[PDB]
Design an enzyme around this catalytic site. Structure first.
Site, mmCIF file in Angstrom:
data_model
loop_
_atom_site.group_PDB
_atom_site.id
_atom_site.type_symbol
_atom_site.label_atom_id
_atom_site.label_comp_id
_atom_site.label_asym_id
_atom_site.label_seq_id
_atom_site.Cartn_x
_atom_site.Cartn_y
_atom_site.Cartn_z
ATOM 1 N N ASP A 166 0.853 -1.223 0.000
ATOM 2 C CA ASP A 166 0.000 0.000 0.000
ATOM 3 C C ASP A 166 0.878 1.259 0.000
ATOM 4 O OD1 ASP A 166 -2.362 -1.530 0.035
ATOM 5 O OD2 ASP A 166 -3.276 -0.207 1.505
ATOM 6 N N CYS B 4 -1.647 0.307 -13.527
ATOM 7 C CA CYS B 4 -1.772 0.339 -12.046
ATOM 8 C C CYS B 4 -3.023 1.199 -11.857
ATOM 9 C CB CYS B 4 -0.438 0.771 -11.450
ATOM 10 S SG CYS B 4 0.270 2.261 -12.199
ATOM 11 N N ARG C 84 3.931 2.422 -10.767
ATOM 12 C CA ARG C 84 4.291 0.984 -10.832
ATOM 13 C C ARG C 84 4.414 0.525 -12.297
ATOM 14 N NH1 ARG C 84 -0.158 -1.028 -6.405
ATOM 15 N NH2 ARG C 84 0.360 0.586 -4.854
ATOM 16 N N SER C 85 3.507 0.961 -13.149
ATOM 17 C CA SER C 85 3.493 0.636 -14.605
ATOM 18 C C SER C 85 4.808 1.080 -15.240
ATOM 19 C CB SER C 85 2.318 1.297 -15.278
ATOM 20 O OG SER C 85 1.091 0.752 -14.828
ATOM 21 N N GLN D 293 6.873 7.807 -10.197
ATOM 22 C CA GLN D 293 6.128 8.871 -9.466
ATOM 23 C C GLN D 293 6.957 9.409 -8.296
ATOM 24 O OE1 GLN D 293 1.994 7.016 -9.184
ATOM 25 N NE2 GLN D 293 1.483 9.195 -9.186
#
Ligand SMILES: CNCc1cccc(Cl)c1
Length: 281
Positions: free
Chosen positions: A180, A214, A220-221, A261
């Site tokens: 998370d 994602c 994450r992608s 990110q």
């Protein structure tokens, strides 16, 4: 060599600084189609938009828009579609894109619920005997099989074009253990997952581009296609240490904004590539 560059940035704690230079150097292209008022409810996040030049177009005459980008890595001979997690109203558009682009694999790097909020619509069937029909795009989706492992799930799906009665098999690769908050401690299970996607043939040039998502399709992608591309380059080049992960990231950012990110995701990308480099070596 990036192993030594890693130790420098890490010992000096300069990750936030490297990350800001990437932010500064990154391309900015128009995203006019994404900002049209008729497309407001096709975007999960108002600050994450595909560039007009690289956006995927749906073949529907009405509204061709989906929040999705084609990332073309010429030297590596790899393409990827990066997209957001579908919305309740875009699940039909998502599967239409998979159909139209001849994709063989979907890679999902998020859970449907994270931090107590929905990150994605449930866009695939949970049981063999309960298929999904997308009336807006005339597609039927059936779960054929599901193989649940510790770190990921692989599902075989059948996608049927109700208009032409053609069917295709789609593989759904679902990485279920990204935490998370932050990034995984070790890149081992992420590398294992990436090698499983490769082994399926989903990333091969005899298919359309893999669809990766994602929640926003940038963080994450981003880590997924950065690691894949950098390893492939280190296997193609005379000198593997000529591969600069910052340069590759900037090339990918020409095609979709914001890939990677956080400084933590950047550090994790280096670690994945270094360890994945250790592998095969
Ligand atoms: C697959 N990339 C890892 C690597 C690093 C250095 C040399 C080779 Cl052949 C492969």
């Amino acid at each position: 060599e990036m192993e030594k560059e890693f130790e420098q940035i890490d010992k000096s704690g300069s990750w936030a600084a490297i990350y800001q230079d990437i932010r500064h150097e990154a391309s900015d292209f128009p995203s006019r189609v994404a900002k049209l008022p008729k497309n407001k409810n096709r975007n999960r996040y108002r600050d994450v938009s595909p560039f007009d030049h690289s956006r995927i177009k749906l073949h529907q005459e009405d509204n061709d828009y989906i929040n999705a980008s084609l990332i073309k890595m010429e030297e590596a001979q790899r393409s990827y579609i990066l997209t957001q997690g579908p919305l309740p109203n875009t699940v039909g558009h998502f599967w239409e894109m998979v159909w139209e682009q001849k994709s063989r694999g979907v890679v999902m790097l998020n859970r449907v619920m994270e931090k107590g909020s929905l990150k994605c619509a449930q866009y695939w069937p949970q049981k063999e005997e309960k298929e999904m029909i997308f009336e807006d795009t005339n597609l039927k989706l059936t779960l054929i099989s599901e193989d649940i492992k510790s770190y990921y799930t692989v599902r075989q799906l059948e996608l049927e074009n109700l208009t032409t009665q053609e069917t295709r098999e789609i593989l759904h690769f679902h990485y279920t253990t990204w935490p998370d908050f932050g990034v995984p401690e070790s890149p081992a299970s992420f590398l294992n997952f990436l090698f499983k996607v490769r082994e399926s043939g989903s990333l091969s040039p005899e298919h359309g581009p893999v669809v990766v998502h994602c929640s926003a399709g940038i963080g994450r992608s981003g880590t997924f296609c950065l690691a894949d591309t950098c390893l492939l380059l280190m296997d193609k080049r005379k000198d593997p240490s000529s591969v600069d992960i910052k340069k590759v990231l900037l090339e990918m950012r020409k095609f979709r904004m914001g890939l990677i990110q956080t400084a933590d995701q950047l550090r994790f990308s280096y670690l994945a590539v270094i360890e994945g480099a250790k592998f095969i070596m």
